[PDB]
Amino acid sequence: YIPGEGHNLQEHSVVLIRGGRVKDLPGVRYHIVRGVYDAAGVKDRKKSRSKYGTKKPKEA
Amino acid sequence: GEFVRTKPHVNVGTIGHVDHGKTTLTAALTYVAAAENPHVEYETAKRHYSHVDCPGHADYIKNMITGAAQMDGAILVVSAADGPMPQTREHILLARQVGVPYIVVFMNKVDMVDDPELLDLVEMEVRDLLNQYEFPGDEVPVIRGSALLALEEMHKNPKTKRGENEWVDKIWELLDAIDEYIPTPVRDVDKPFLMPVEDVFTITGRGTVATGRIERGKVKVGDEVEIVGLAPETRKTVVTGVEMHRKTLQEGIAGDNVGLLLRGVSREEVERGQVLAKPGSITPHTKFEASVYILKKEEGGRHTGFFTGYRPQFYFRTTDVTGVVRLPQGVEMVMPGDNVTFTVELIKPVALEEGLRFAIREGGRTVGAGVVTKILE
Amino acid sequence: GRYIGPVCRLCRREGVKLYLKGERCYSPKCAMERRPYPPGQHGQKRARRPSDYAVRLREKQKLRRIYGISERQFRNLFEEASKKKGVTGSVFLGLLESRLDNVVYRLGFAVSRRQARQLVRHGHITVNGRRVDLPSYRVRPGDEIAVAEKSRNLELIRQNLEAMKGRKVGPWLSLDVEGMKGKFLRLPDREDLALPVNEQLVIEFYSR
Amino acid sequence: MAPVLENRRARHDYEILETYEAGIALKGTEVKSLRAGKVDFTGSFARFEDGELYLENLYIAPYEKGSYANVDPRRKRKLLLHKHELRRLLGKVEQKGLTLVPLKIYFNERGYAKVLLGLARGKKAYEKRREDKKEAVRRALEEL
RNA sequence: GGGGGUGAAACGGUCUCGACAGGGCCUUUGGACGUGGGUUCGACUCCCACCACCUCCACCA
RNA sequence: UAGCGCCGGCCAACUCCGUGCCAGCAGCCGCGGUAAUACGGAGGGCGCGAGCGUUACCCGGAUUCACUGGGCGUAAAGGG
RNA sequence: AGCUAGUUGGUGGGGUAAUGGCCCACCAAGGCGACGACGGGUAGCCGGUCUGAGAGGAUGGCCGGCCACAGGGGCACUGAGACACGGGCCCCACUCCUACGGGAGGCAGCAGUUAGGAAUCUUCCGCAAUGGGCGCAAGCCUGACGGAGCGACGCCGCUU
């Protein structure tokens, strides 16, 4: 599974697999760790970030 | 072997059309110069040299720029048998863009096809060409000779001392033209420290090493730096060896073309386009606006106007990343000539400072030139 | 480390008056007065029937928050408390009290523990001669809590220590208010610390 | 060279009276993905904010080649319809609860992504079973 | 760092038929074939420089 | 210097707007179909604090291999 | 689900510090197996350790004890002791020197590289201490060890 809203994963990208099924999608048993390798954090994200790759957005 | 500094140090490369002599010549200088004192190097009584040898093609221009961005002067090699050609012309232009100081010249192949005019004709058209680019054409030294014949006889007898062969001598008429004329310049060993990276390679049983020409300040075995740019988040480390031409340097002063040993990094963390800034100074960014003079049909290449979308390639120090030009609001377009100030966002993040002269190259011809106004990313 | 933020905020919410500030938190504005209700956009609406957990929580939170001691310190202390011989609902209190910063407070010097905290950390307070800047230093039976020499002529150790002229000291403590000495007589009991907390529920909160 | 796409799922779903065919404002990086046929219409009705129609909720896979360039799959893509044709659909849409749905997608003679719209029965109320004892007792408890 | 490879049909001729937008009811130009630009009266087609993948070489201060 | 997790139930902590089975959450039950205390942000609250969360693994809960401490008419379980 | 011929035992030997099928002749047909032999998979064992009301379950990283190994594999020599981590002979793989006929070597010591991987550190300082080896002794050697370094990896203390 690829969490968050939006991703940048290509038909051949380097990903880090975590582990956590998805009672919804059949044989899907692992979550892709957002924010590692080709898997980018979540743009605009601001809440539960630690669990969505995105770094602390400076209050600009 | 521990590198011991004595004579002032200069960086000088050799450019020119293909098959004109560049590589041979370098070989030439190397042996000829070494006969006296018990990417190459050579000490010439007065000075100490690092000779970068530009080898590539119109396909390998992504190193020409870099190579030239350094060197405090360049040897323009021109074939006597052929005379100025498109690559002989192209480099000169770049030597100009990259802003190289003083351009010595070496008509080569003089050993072949002998003609009274040929030599004077050619020597005249080379100068002519330089002058066509704001270089001290007439004022600049033009040595006549044969790299091969010098090199050849240096193999016959690698002891040949100046004055013992007409061909070897011509090399000295060059080394000499370089010893004087091409001036050693201002270093700036009193500023922070910083060094772009030109080549990153792993030294077995030691680890990663990063080479480049020390921009400003110095570095010593035991200091601390921060590889900045092209990476998700800057890396802070400590250096463990400053070497120059396979020799152990004690302190890398600015102007030094050296290899720095980064303790702990993996060869994947370092690249060409980063910098080994000393902590605190410099920081990665991807946004800024700036003053950019846009060359006209006359120079560079842009012969039309460009809008805001434009994704030219921006060349900073050793590398170049593509960026987007966010024209200011109320402008609408730029045209050949004039100096415009606009915002740009690089797809990749790169080390930046208040006043950093960078260039803009697109479509194979330098379209712009400019300095950094403010940092926004 | 040690909360550090709106305290006359915890006063309410808990709903049972707190005084981490001392004077103000003692005057006609312990925040409670005017706002006896918990913080936030809500704070004063039908407070749903608390659950068995909410309670255990509030009790331990109450008591803990009544020292500053962060969960790790608090809880870590409770554990040891359990071990020791004898009832715990008391011993846990026995130790929560031997805490120097607390003792130093129970004995004046500060119009509150938060102010008793900054008083130890800055070398002001001492014990049996040598100083101690460890709020966590658990005080033994006897060790007096004398002030310093650079500390006395202080515009603030004055005022604070001048609230002693009259008022009495804890049933397990003495007090030479001239040499600012006074000792630690004995381990306090459940009543002596008639605190607005039911220690039992706090023993249980730490089960599930 | 792209096969005719289709919303089999809602061709049956809503009764179809009149139909309208209009071109769209494709990003091209999208035009690729449409030629590959990787796109579905599930949960997508077409409306018009202001005076311009915009097929919304249509999913067009991203173009792997296109890398960072591609826009999000569900985009408010704009359609192209004659002015008199556009007003007739507005008359029917504003006035009554009739939907405009992507009926299918393809490329005409000239080779442009051309979407086929339909007239919708709409209605189709979604039955929602309700009130779980738990809540009921729950509220009683608190309220009183 | 470079070489090659894939960005639709072994293909120079209109215009999304259309709505938004700038000139000249109908003509029309822009936009959409990875992105940025050239060349043409005119490009999906043709050069360029980027981008992301693929693939083959290079690489010990 | 102050961060991180959580705020539908289990579980301590509620409101406005955005989206309209879309985008998304998710440990289980389950939320999302135009007033979403469950999605995204904000305000606020809770927990914890140089840490906070996730993932994997062991025991626990699980008297769910039961010795302590289970069962077998119809729930799995009497051998033709 | 059956296993076994040096197999089980015997007489006499060979061998070792010493018993012994440990090895060898010769004689006998024996030995083991549902109380699980043989074979397969996994695994270094314990003190402890985590969990648990407990009986249990899970684990064996650090520190102490035993065992096994030292690139894969065989062998002995020396010696109180080894069939020897930085000793030797030999075959194999691999890398390196060569004047192409034969040489040098083994980090699972310390520190370091590279590969693999989600991931694991300084080419450091000192023999002052403690311990060891050699020596009458002074003393030499000791990457044991006493320390410093890097990493919130953990626990405890501390601050804003």
Ligand SMILES: C/C=C\C=C\[C@@H]1O[C@](O)([C@H](CC)C(=O)NC/C=C/C=C(\C)[C@@H](OC)[C@@H](C)[C@@H]2O[C@H](/C=C/C=C/C=C(\C)C(=O)c3c(O)cc[nH]c3=O)[C@H](O)[C@@H]2O)[C@H](O)[C@H](O)C1(C)C
């Ligand atoms: C250009 C490539 C890399 C630049 C890198 C950076 O540039 C710099 O940013 C630099 C800072 C000023 C920069 O911006 N360079 C960027 C720009 C710099 C531009 C400077 C100097 C100018 O002056 C306005 C200078 C060239 C100027 O042109 C004139 C000549 C023009 C000739 C044009 C071509 C002609 C006839 C021609 O036949 C020709 C051809 O050559 C090729 C093909 N077909 C042709 O038909 C004259 O000779 C003047 O001298 C810094 O130096 C950085 O440190 C850097 C070196 C890293």
Ligand SMILES: Nc1nc2c(ncn2[C@@H]2O[C@H](COP(=O)(O)OP(=O)(O)O)[C@@H](O)[C@H]2O)c(=O)[nH]1
């Ligand atoms: N006749 C002649 N040929 C030369 C001389 N020097 C070099 N060459 C030849 O020039 C050719 C290209 O030389 P090279 O150094 O590779 O030129 P580069 O293209 O600049 O590297 C080689 O075949 C050389 O032998 C010379 O002095 N005289």
Ligand SMILES: [Mg+2]
């Ligand atoms: Mg060459």
Ligand SMILES: [Zn+2]
């Ligand atoms: Zn108060």
